[PDB]
């Protein structure tokens, strides 16, 4: 039983994020728990303040015609309990629900440990015989407590795209809004726990430049290469199969190289030190002790710049 | 209260994928969230446009007779909220729901990291005393937004098998349709993270051809063999118990060999270098330095061709 | 409001497996999704074909008296949607539902990787003041599509025990039926991934029979023993705490031995080669190179026979 | 509408375990699926056998006043379907439901692999204006089929504490009963898979007493220490964070010691054999070959006795 | 149909924790199962004790006006069954439900293994045309049995913030309460299983100060570094991505250092003992045998103090 309008009925929206949590990098989802604030003029039930009752008259959902406001990017049906419905004199309705649903917004892992994200919530609404345009009411969109959690992420701002995008979808126009949750990552636990430990093993790796014992040079370069796999695998697990290249995926892989040429050197410092030409060997070994850390720190400036600086 | 027909009542179907996600290779399932569009002539409620009401008349599901359209390959009951029902003059009904259910479609891991898949959604419908044939309406089957996600997979096309397959199941004919979601994998994160690291350790493995120290040769070939298990196990975990052989399961196992004969060589380069016959030893060792990488790259062309090229 | 009988009312059952999946070895359960077909004479609503209506008259569950058919070995309440109810003239009722519930049937892991299983579904029914006997109608028990999945298992046959087992349970006789799902395992992925890799490490283990370097013999026998734990642990995890002995649990453990006496030998080949008695040492070492693989392959014939052959 | 009594109305209880399963040591819970048998005199609906109807009259739950019998230690609401209600002449009611709920009973891991447990189910009932005392009827408490499963546990007995415990909880007396499920563990798969493998590695550990090569002694004692972690971690995972000490937690940790002093010895057998005092070294090494296994087997009798014997 | 008041209607709250469990450090949540006790004066249904019925009159929820009391920090809708409603003469209502919901309270891992926590449950309530203030009734808040479980945590006290916090949220004041669950961890299983084993490997690490064999010194310091990753990874897994530094994350990382300079020393004890200057080498090595354990135990006092002592 929809509201007999004279033009496209505007529905007024708003989201008050109450709780954020379980942002799942692998799955590219996250769970939210918020208020949904809707409103519209249904002149059809305006109501003579003086003549009867009081200021505003409370209805149960069955009584009034309510607009179906579906969330677009949601795993299952949104999970909402209705909080209050308050029809104004002029026929204006004040709806408030408190849904919670896991939302499917994508993430850009291009700078992985040091990335910022922009999550989305959508809200479509389909037309019947009056057209429905949705739009935001910013006093119910200040939505975000001063307690919005979302572990391991700094929450920058909850805003929304005022202008809706109105489609024609299957011979019936819909109207979609864009609610934006912007967050930077709390990179850090990534250093004492990944970045640093990863570097340390790389350095030990090439302690075998000041060494001549092949036995203790392979026991050297090789033992550490293993440990680095232990970190490549640790990192690769809390992170999805990107079709592009991560930052840490870069350096973690560039690392795989300074373990090859490292093992190349120690290997050649020997089919060159049994070839009774230690003239050359400890020439190269002497040299690696510079080329390596330099070319590294150099390619890390080259690499890092290639990602952040551009 | 079914629609008094004169022949098999055609029901017209359609699916607009709104969201795709949680494709689970182990479980061989995936979750979808779409529109379901149905329609049929129930002349029994045609309705004199002029004589009353308006262009089209809205019903609640309880009022009209609606066809039970069950999804075949679904874990639990599909999870659908009804979006609109609009009966036309002639008695034509326009139904639209927005279900979300995890679907059980199988996958072919024969090319694992480089595989393409064809997921299915089914839709049966059982007959009563008028027969029901289902069939697709392609304006509600263009189903797939321009945002269909499905992480780590490229989505190629959402189509469907126009011709239904009508069974006789328990003295009552059913009619089933086939909705096809075709996707290729985003192989890649499989290289910097599996393929390459896996290769590197294999190479270092057989650096012990330019070496004579047994101690540093087993410390050599053996250390890396371990690391390779660390990758065989990593890979074997995000992948189900196929009764056939995966591609990466092949090469990952062919790899287990070039670690055995590698260990064979270093082992014989010694019961042959203590047998005061280093004549022979550093003949073999010298040789392995070719046989190995060749036979490998050879068996990789042999292997790769055996999977992709045929 | 039960059917006024003259003797024990027979209820006629039937299950059409539509989907099988999530067989969980650890949990000893599995999920099924099937049809449930029931039928009985309730003469009390026989209905004068000519005098009124038509051939068969459709009821909603609230209208008719229906027998409670509970599933015995089920985790929670069975999860069923009712598909059709069709009362015949004589008063015969035709009921059909489409339940899905995870079933708790036990498994016998005595031959683990090479085992066949017989899963059960039960169906009791309690009496009131007429006795209820259940029994099977085999045209609705041909239940099993030609698509019954159940990953990593070959499905041999869906049958059922015609004769019911009628208990007296708490001063009211019940009647239980036995629906049997027989499946063999797809042992195989167990070879390239467990059996073979497990053997290979055992072999390398005792390459240290053709060796004299204690350093590279412990680096030898010992490194492999580790790797075998890596497999004992892998296997032990996808498998419950049996009070009996698995097959692979046997050989996996018999393996632990050929790594002890292996380590025993290498160890004695030395407190006997420093005891300036290499007379004896390279007598034993020479010998082990036979005793071991023989006694193994011998005890594997002895073991294998002990499980399968008996 | 409760039963007008003259004193505390006795409600008669009973539980027929139909199915047991998913005992979860980590979570300290388990799932059961049983019958619940209740009964009480509601003289208020006694009913003139001859004057009307028959021997006993069947009611739907809505018709009669039924006592709320909540289970105390249950995760969520118990999940029950009602099986039959049969009011006797005198006004006696016969109630039977078939619930299934996961129960939260605690476990005592003090003897871990060799422990026996006593699981509980509770049943309270709150009073209104007549007091409710619950009590057991032992013909509906013989509850336990001859098929009660519960994998990896031997089921010893299903009994119950006849005398209820009546509390005063919030100005209204409740009455609670105690249903006892006693089970011993099927320790065993713990030997071929944990105990034995764990010992074997410990023994090889100290094969390095009959050795002099430091390289092969660290490669010896150390390699095995790792493997033992692989077991400590395996065990620690299928077992919760006890505030007390497990049995296997003891020996698994006492083991950590015989790997330290083991490594201590091999280490000192060398800063004492390079100190040109091999006089002493192979005095100690000689000695360890006894002290160790003895002190172990000694501390294992000391330890084992400390747990089981007391 | 709300209670015609003369001022802000006070609603009187109370929570009796019946069960605690599944505290999930990763997810920062936990499940509770408690009583919820509400009460308020609805003079509108006061009821002439003598004139009719009895002392107190029982209602079903549909009959009375009940306040919506939503829990704030909850994943999904709270899961509550209603236990009793008892309206007093004066019009006072006595409500009791038994909900169970997983709650989202944050945790402070700054002292990880030795941390104490303060979990929250919230309860808001929105106003309509009479204002709603909530407040606690402490005889129904003594909520916590003498069996409150919560594995691996010592439960210190269940209390609540008497004074509510009244917001203005979207043109309608709400009122929120704070129920506090305080718990210390059962650190301990963290010692025999993490702390101690972690230390032991560190010590063995630097046994290679009383050694001169580079081969057995890298086989020494390096083997253990690996094992330490095995612990860093074990610990890092049962713990979320803190933006701050854990205690065990500190020492676990400070440990990474005493493995670097350890490896630095053994490495320099050699490009200095081949440089025919063993004058210096076994000067340094001699020294490390003190500097290390001291600087450690020193930096552990420095570190530990930095977390607990401040
Ligand atoms: As090693």
Short mmCIF file of N, CA and C in Angstrom, two decimals, chain D residues 72-139:
data_model
loop_
_atom_site.label_atom_id
_atom_site.label_comp_id
_atom_site.label_asym_id
_atom_site.label_seq_id
_atom_site.Cartn_x
_atom_site.Cartn_y
_atom_site.Cartn_z
N UNK D 72 20.49 -26.52 32.86
CA UNK D 72 21.30 -25.47 33.47
C UNK D 72 22.57 -25.15 32.69
N UNK D 73 23.43 -26.15 32.58
CA UNK D 73 24.68 -26.03 31.83
C UNK D 73 24.50 -26.30 30.35
N UNK D 74 23.83 -25.39 29.66
CA UNK D 74 23.69 -25.54 28.22
C UNK D 74 24.09 -24.28 27.51
N UNK D 75 24.83 -24.43 26.41
CA UNK D 75 25.24 -23.27 25.64
C UNK D 75 24.03 -22.40 25.28
N UNK D 76 23.23 -22.85 24.32
CA UNK D 76 22.02 -22.12 23.94
C UNK D 76 20.76 -22.78 24.46
N UNK D 77 19.61 -22.31 24.01
CA UNK D 77 18.37 -22.98 24.34
C UNK D 77 18.42 -24.42 23.80
N UNK D 78 18.20 -25.37 24.70
CA UNK D 78 17.93 -26.76 24.34
C UNK D 78 17.02 -26.84 23.11
N UNK D 79 17.19 -27.87 22.29
CA UNK D 79 16.49 -27.90 21.00
C UNK D 79 15.52 -29.08 20.90
N UNK D 80 14.31 -28.90 21.42
CA UNK D 80 13.40 -30.02 21.66
C UNK D 80 12.13 -30.03 20.82
N UNK D 81 11.80 -31.21 20.29
CA UNK D 81 10.52 -31.46 19.64
C UNK D 81 9.70 -32.32 20.61
N UNK D 82 8.42 -32.00 20.78
CA UNK D 82 7.56 -32.75 21.72
C UNK D 82 7.03 -34.04 21.12
N UNK D 83 7.18 -35.16 21.84
CA UNK D 83 6.85 -36.46 21.27
C UNK D 83 5.43 -37.00 21.60
N UNK D 84 4.96 -36.74 22.81
CA UNK D 84 3.61 -37.18 23.17
C UNK D 84 3.21 -36.62 24.53
N UNK D 85 1.92 -36.34 24.69
CA UNK D 85 1.38 -35.96 25.99
C UNK D 85 0.12 -36.78 26.28
N UNK D 86 0.12 -37.50 27.40
CA UNK D 86 -0.96 -38.44 27.71
C UNK D 86 -1.45 -38.31 29.13
N UNK D 87 -2.56 -37.59 29.31
CA UNK D 87 -3.15 -37.41 30.64
C UNK D 87 -3.93 -38.64 31.09
N UNK D 88 -3.59 -39.13 32.28
CA UNK D 88 -4.28 -40.26 32.89
C UNK D 88 -5.60 -39.83 33.55
N UNK D 89 -6.47 -40.80 33.90
CA UNK D 89 -7.71 -40.53 34.63
C UNK D 89 -7.54 -39.61 35.83
N UNK D 90 -6.80 -40.06 36.84
CA UNK D 90 -6.65 -39.32 38.09
C UNK D 90 -6.22 -37.86 37.92
N UNK D 91 -5.76 -37.52 36.72
CA UNK D 91 -5.28 -36.18 36.44
C UNK D 91 -3.78 -36.18 36.25
N UNK D 92 -3.21 -37.38 36.14
CA UNK D 92 -1.76 -37.56 35.94
C UNK D 92 -1.35 -37.33 34.48
N UNK D 93 -0.27 -36.58 34.28
CA UNK D 93 0.17 -36.25 32.93
C UNK D 93 1.44 -37.00 32.56
N UNK D 94 1.49 -37.49 31.32
CA UNK D 94 2.67 -38.18 30.80
C UNK D 94 3.30 -37.43 29.60
N UNK D 95 4.41 -36.74 29.86
CA UNK D 95 5.06 -35.87 28.86
C UNK D 95 6.34 -36.52 28.36
N UNK D 96 6.61 -36.37 27.07
CA UNK D 96 7.83 -36.89 26.48
C UNK D 96 8.31 -36.03 25.31
N UNK D 97 9.51 -35.49 25.44
CA UNK D 97 10.13 -34.72 24.38
C UNK D 97 11.46 -35.35 23.94
N UNK D 98 12.00 -34.88 22.82
CA UNK D 98 13.27 -35.40 22.34
C UNK D 98 14.24 -34.28 21.97
N UNK D 99 14.85 -33.72 23.00
CA UNK D 99 15.77 -32.60 22.84
C UNK D 99 17.14 -33.06 22.36
N UNK D 100 17.93 -32.08 21.94
CA UNK D 100 19.33 -32.28 21.63
C UNK D 100 19.95 -30.93 21.92
N UNK D 101 20.91 -30.90 22.82
CA UNK D 101 21.64 -29.66 23.07
C UNK D 101 23.08 -29.93 23.47
N UNK D 102 24.00 -29.04 23.11
CA UNK D 102 25.38 -29.22 23.56
C UNK D 102 25.51 -28.73 25.00
N UNK D 103 26.05 -29.61 25.82
CA UNK D 103 26.10 -29.44 27.26
C UNK D 103 27.50 -28.98 27.69
N UNK D 104 27.56 -28.10 28.68
CA UNK D 104 28.85 -27.60 29.12
C UNK D 104 29.21 -28.26 30.44
N UNK D 105 29.81 -29.45 30.39
CA UNK D 105 30.38 -30.07 31.59
C UNK D 105 31.90 -29.98 31.52
N UNK D 106 32.54 -29.73 32.68
CA UNK D 106 33.98 -29.58 32.84
C UNK D 106 34.68 -30.94 32.88
N UNK D 107 35.98 -30.93 32.61
CA UNK D 107 36.76 -32.15 32.58
C UNK D 107 38.05 -31.99 33.39
N UNK D 108 38.54 -33.10 33.94
CA UNK D 108 39.76 -33.09 34.74
C UNK D 108 40.91 -33.81 34.04
N UNK D 109 41.77 -33.02 33.39
CA UNK D 109 42.84 -33.52 32.55
C UNK D 109 44.08 -33.89 33.35
N UNK D 110 43.94 -34.00 34.67
CA UNK D 110 45.08 -34.26 35.54
C UNK D 110 45.82 -35.56 35.17
N UNK D 111 45.07 -36.56 34.70
CA UNK D 111 45.70 -37.79 34.20
C UNK D 111 45.68 -37.89 32.66
N UNK D 112 45.60 -36.74 32.00
CA UNK D 112 45.19 -36.62 30.59
C UNK D 112 44.98 -37.92 29.80
N UNK D 113 46.07 -38.54 29.32
CA UNK D 113 45.76 -39.58 28.33
C UNK D 113 45.00 -40.74 28.98
N UNK D 114 45.09 -40.83 30.30
CA UNK D 114 44.52 -41.94 31.05
C UNK D 114 43.56 -41.42 32.08
N UNK D 115 42.57 -40.66 31.63
CA UNK D 115 41.64 -40.02 32.55
C UNK D 115 40.24 -40.58 32.39
N UNK D 116 39.48 -40.52 33.47
CA UNK D 116 38.07 -40.83 33.43
C UNK D 116 37.24 -39.58 33.76
N UNK D 117 36.08 -39.46 33.14
CA UNK D 117 35.31 -38.24 33.28
C UNK D 117 33.91 -38.51 33.76
N UNK D 118 33.31 -37.49 34.35
CA UNK D 118 31.93 -37.56 34.82
C UNK D 118 31.13 -36.34 34.36
N UNK D 119 30.45 -36.49 33.22
CA UNK D 119 29.73 -35.38 32.60
C UNK D 119 28.37 -35.15 33.27
N UNK D 120 27.87 -33.91 33.26
CA UNK D 120 26.60 -33.59 33.91
C UNK D 120 25.54 -32.93 33.00
N UNK D 121 24.29 -33.25 33.29
CA UNK D 121 23.13 -32.59 32.73
C UNK D 121 22.26 -32.19 33.93
N UNK D 122 21.58 -31.05 33.89
CA UNK D 122 21.08 -30.52 35.16
C UNK D 122 19.57 -30.40 35.37
N UNK D 123 18.86 -29.60 34.58
CA UNK D 123 17.40 -29.50 34.80
C UNK D 123 16.99 -28.73 36.07
N UNK D 124 16.78 -27.43 35.95
CA UNK D 124 16.15 -26.69 37.03
C UNK D 124 14.67 -26.53 36.72
N UNK D 125 13.94 -25.94 37.67
CA UNK D 125 12.53 -25.62 37.50
C UNK D 125 12.09 -24.61 38.58
N UNK D 126 11.50 -23.50 38.15
CA UNK D 126 11.25 -22.38 39.05
C UNK D 126 9.81 -22.42 39.56
N UNK D 127 9.58 -21.99 40.80
CA UNK D 127 8.23 -22.03 41.39
C UNK D 127 7.43 -20.74 41.16
N UNK D 128 6.11 -20.78 41.38
CA UNK D 128 5.22 -19.67 40.98
C UNK D 128 4.38 -19.25 42.20
N UNK D 129 3.47 -20.14 42.60
CA UNK D 129 2.62 -19.94 43.78
C UNK D 129 2.29 -21.29 44.45
N UNK D 130 2.56 -22.37 43.71
CA UNK D 130 2.78 -23.71 44.27
C UNK D 130 4.28 -23.95 44.07
N UNK D 131 4.93 -24.63 45.02
CA UNK D 131 6.36 -24.95 44.90
C UNK D 131 6.53 -26.14 43.99
N UNK D 132 7.61 -26.12 43.21
CA UNK D 132 7.96 -27.26 42.39
C UNK D 132 9.22 -27.95 42.85
N UNK D 133 9.05 -29.22 43.17
CA UNK D 133 10.15 -30.11 43.44
C UNK D 133 10.15 -31.04 42.25
N UNK D 134 11.33 -31.25 41.69
CA UNK D 134 11.58 -32.24 40.65
C UNK D 134 12.07 -33.52 41.32
N UNK D 135 11.93 -34.67 40.65
CA UNK D 135 12.54 -35.93 41.11
C UNK D 135 12.53 -36.98 39.99
N UNK D 136 13.45 -37.95 40.06
CA UNK D 136 13.65 -38.92 38.95
C UNK D 136 12.72 -40.17 38.96
N UNK D 137 12.24 -40.57 37.78
CA UNK D 137 11.51 -41.84 37.60
C UNK D 137 12.36 -42.81 36.80
N UNK D 138 12.90 -43.81 37.48
CA UNK D 138 14.04 -44.58 36.98
C UNK D 138 13.78 -45.51 35.80
N UNK D 139 12.52 -45.60 35.38
CA UNK D 139 12.17 -46.41 34.23
C UNK D 139 12.28 -45.59 32.94
#
